[PDB]
């Protein structure tokens, strides 16, 4: 009758910041304390420090090598002589977010108390969120700063005519900063609302539906939005110069680290004023470079909406890659294609964040997220070196971030923390170089019915990655899957039955010295060294538990 693993954890173990620069001290908080307990600090399965669990609050200076993930696990020796993991936390030592981005958002900037904002940022911190997209903070797409640099409006009305407080924006930036997170301001690349100044943005800058500059292209918005959004040509230099100035104004008032560039995606066949093809995917590269040039110390990320623009922008000055995923990219195998493709487009230079809104249909109404839906999709994304923008004040159910129709159960919260712990702790193995492989792995007891990736409903999918001298094997469990659509749009996906103590046979040519297992579903993701035999090319071992996602590491 065991509860889910995350939920069984006797201790909640937390750290003060989301991430740490080399040389910065990690301060831990445990919610409760147990006798006869030892803290193990691990790097890639290896214990690098042991110390007595001696109280609720203590510090650790991590090794200074940059871009390293660690797992911290606390072990109690029970009176029978068995050991229990009480709790675990992952730690990212990164000088900068761009290598291993864990992106979240914020969506409400009105009169929210400091203590309320604090609780929001603290929560994100515990997911190790290392940067935040500030969504619909801006006054206007064509003028994101309300007021002047000299005299910034303290209170402005947003695109749905709600109040935004300068102090709330500044406050959240400061709070994210205090947790080692980056703050990225949302705007479109090319957005104009109907109150823009026609002396500053001229007819010649707009994108049109026809070749005779008759009808302007636009994002149609109903109530409560104040305006439809007109579209300019991102390659037009006057627009680039205009928005560069708007950006500087923002940066002079609000200490954003950079600009989240949004777009509306493929607009079909649309034209410049002169009747020429606006071909927007090939306009974005010049736009990115102009924006970077105008503020070289400020970060840029740009959303390739369903991969529109991705190939064209992947070699520009973007911190990492971002894809909002839509039809027909609805299969699990389509998420991994997007990740494979982004690697290729960036020549293996940039990792990806996926904006991939879960339980999308369900979210038309108040409800709960379907926990197994969310977990299985993040198991796939994380196993394949992806990252998921999904968490702010609430978890995203729609492309309109303020939509908060769906809530997360306490069970999902607990589990998802272990998932973010997992993908932080083991980032070096998930998305830090190496080549995908196709391991020859077989059940030795018939408890598992194994296939390769991409997955089949009814089967455990095995996929491998060669990372340095290590062979990694991910098991992702579709045994009980009733759909291979990642979005679980109606919240129908099944919880996988636990498989326990499952014999595996693996062909591995080289000598094996150590095999270890880690699963976010087992012991908080703590690395567990496995017994094994090796006979020529043939390694045998047993995995303790597969539910959604287990990782086996052969050294
Ligand atoms: O669900 C409401 C609304 O959400 C999105 O549109 C509003 C969105 O439009 C652009 O992205 C602007 O730059 C943002 O400031 C706005 O929040 C959907 O696109 C739309 O279909 C939907 O009605
Ligand atoms: O145990 C030696 C030292 O280890 C470091 O990692 C901790 O940050 C110190 O507080 C401690 O005194
Ligand atoms: Na980081």
Report the SS3 class of residue 296. coil
Q: Which of ligand 1's atoms lies nearest the C-alpha of 400?
A: 4
Nearest CA, atom 6, ligand 1: 400
**CB distance 111 to 165 below 8 Å:** yes
Between the CA of residue 281 and those of 244, 259, 271, 306, what are the distances in Å?
A: 20, 19, 13, 12
End-to-end CA, the chain: 35
**Phi–psi pair at 165, nearest 5 degrees:** -100, 120
H-helix segments, 295-409 = 310-313, 332-345, 371-383
Ligand 1: residue of 141, 162, 218, 221 to mutate (most ligand atoms within 8 A of CB) is: 221
Calculate how far, in angstroms, residue 135's C-alpha sits from the geometric centre of ligand 3.
21
Phi-psi map region of 523: left, alpha, beta (phi>0 left; psi -120 to 50 alpha): left
Supply angle C-alpha 89, 16, 101, rounded to 5. 70
Ion ligand 3 nearby residues (CB, 5 A): 19, 92, 94, 97, 130
Q: For 451, how many CA atoms within 13 A lie in the half-sphere containing its CB?
A: 10
For 165, half-sphere exposure in the C-beta direction (CA atoms, 13 angstrom radius) is 14
Asked if the peptide bond before residue 478 counts as cis, ω within 30 degrees of 0, the response is: no
Experimental method: X-ray
Name the residue at shortest CA distance from atom 23 of ligand 1.
221
Q: How far is CA 361 from CA 341, 366, 393, in A?
A: 27, 11, 20
What does the CA dihedral 131, 400, 396, 280 come to, rounded to 10 degrees? -60
d(CA 9, CA 28): 16
Check pocket membership of 188 for ligand 1, CB cut-off 6 A.
yes
Rounded CA gap, 329 and 67, in Å? 31
Kindly provide the b/e burial profile for residues 179-217, where b requires at least 16 CB atoms within 10 angstroms of the residue's own CB.
bbbbbbbbbbbbbbbeebeeeebeeebbbbbeeebeebb
Nearest CA to ligand 1 atom 17: 400
3-state helix, strand, coil in the chain (%, to 5): 20, 30, 45
Please give the resolution of this entry in Å, rounded to 1 decimal: 1.8
Residue 69: half-sphere exposure toward Cβ, Cα within 13 Å:
26
Q: Please state, in angstroms and rounded to a whole number, the distance separating the CA atoms of residues 24 and 66.
A: 11
Q: How far apart are CA 453 and CA 335, in angstroms?
A: 12
User: Alpha-carbon distance 268 to 215, whole Å?
Assistant: 14
Q: What is the 3-state secondary structure (H, E, C) of 228-280?
A: CEEEECCCCHHHHHHHHHHHHHHHHHCCCCEEEEECCCCCCCCECCCCCECCH
167 vs 315: CA distance, rounded Å:
36
Residues, the chain: 555
- Give dist(CA 102, CA 100) in Å, integer: 7
State the Cα angle at 74 between 73 and 78, rounded to 5°.
135
Best mutation site among 219, 259, 406 for ligand 1 pocket (most ligand atoms within 8 Å of CB): 219
Q: Which fold has domain 103-431?
A: TIM Barrel (3.20.20)
Taking the CA of residue 398 as reference, the ligand 1 atom at the shortest distance is 1
Distance 512 CA to ligand 1 centre (A): 53
Q: What is the number of other CB atoms lying within 10 angstroms of the CB of residue 442?
A: 14
Nearest-angstrom CA–CA distance, 82 and 76? 8
């Amino acid at each position: 009758a065991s509860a889910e693993d995350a939920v069984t954890a006797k201790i909640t173990l937390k750290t003060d910041k989301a991430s740490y620069k080399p040389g910065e001290t990690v301060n831990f908080t445990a919610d409760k304390v147990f006798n006869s307990s030892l803290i193990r600090y691990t790097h890639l399965g290896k214990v690098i420090k042991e110390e007595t669990f001696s109280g609720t609050s203590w510090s650790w200076l991590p090794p200074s090598d940059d871009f390293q993930g660690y797992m911290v696990a606390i072990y109690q020796t029970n009176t029978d002589g068995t050991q229990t993991i009480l709790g675990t936390v992952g730690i990212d030592v990164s000088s900068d977010w761009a290598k291993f981005p864990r992106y979240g958002f914020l969506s409400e900037f009105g009169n929210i108390s400091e203590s309320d904002r604090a609780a929001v940022i603290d929560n994100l911190k515990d997911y190790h969120i290392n940067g935040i997209q500030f969504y619909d903070w801006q006054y206007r797409q064509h003028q994101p700063l309300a007021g002047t640099v000299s005299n910034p409006m303290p209170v402005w009305n947003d695109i749905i005519n709600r109040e935004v407080y300068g102090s709330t924006v500044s406050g959240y930036i400061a709070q994210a900063h205090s947790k080692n997170m980056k703050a990225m301001f949302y705007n479109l690349a090319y957005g104009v609302l109907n109150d823009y100044d026609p002396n500053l943005i001229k007819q010649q800058q707009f994108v049109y539906k026809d070749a005779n500059h008759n009808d302007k292209d636009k994002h149609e918005l109903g109530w409560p939005f104040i305006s439809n959004i007109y579209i300019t040509d991102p390659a037009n230099t006057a627009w680039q110069n205009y928005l560069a100035q708007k950006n500087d104004d923002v940066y002079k008032v609000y200490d954003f680290d950079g600009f989240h560039i949004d777009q509306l995606g493929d607009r079909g066949n649309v034209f410049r004023y002169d009747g020429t093809n606006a071909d927007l995917k090939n306009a974005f590269p010049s736009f990115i470079s102009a924006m970077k040039s105008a503020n070289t110390n400020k970060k840029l990320v740009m959303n390739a909406v369903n991969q529109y623009g991705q190939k064209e922008i992947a070699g520009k000055e973007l911190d990492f890659l971002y894809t909002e995923v839509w039809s027909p990219n609805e299969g699990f195998k389509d998420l991994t294609q997007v990740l494979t493709d982004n690697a290729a487009y960036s020549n293996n230079s940039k990792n990806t964040v996926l904006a991939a809104y879960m339980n999308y249909n369900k979210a038309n109404n108040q409800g709960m997220f379907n926990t197994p839906g969310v977990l299985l999709t993040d198991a796939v994304i994380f196993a394949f070196g992806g990252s998921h923008l999904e968490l702010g004040e609430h978890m995203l159910g729609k492309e309109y971030f303020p939509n908060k129709n769906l809530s997360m159960s306490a069970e999902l919260k607990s589990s998802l923390l272990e998932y973010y712990d997992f993908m932080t702790a083991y980032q070096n193995l998930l998305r830090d170089g190496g080549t995908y492989t196709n391991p020859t792995i077989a059940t030795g007891d018939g408890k598992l019915n194994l296939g390769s990736w991409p997955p089949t409903m009814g089967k455990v999918a095995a996929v491998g990655k060669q990372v340095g001298s290590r062979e990694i094997i991910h098991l992702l469990n579709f045994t009980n899957a009733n759909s291979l659509n990642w979005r679980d749009t109606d919240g129908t996906q099944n919880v996988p039955d636990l498989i326990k103590q499952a014999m595996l046979n693996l062909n591995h040519s080289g000598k094996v010295t150590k095999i270890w297992y880690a699963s976010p579903d087992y012991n908080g993701g703590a690395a567990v060294e496995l017994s094994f035999s090796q006979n020529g090319e043939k390694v045998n071992f047993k995995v303790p538990v597969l539910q959604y996602w287990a990782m086996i590491v052969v050294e």
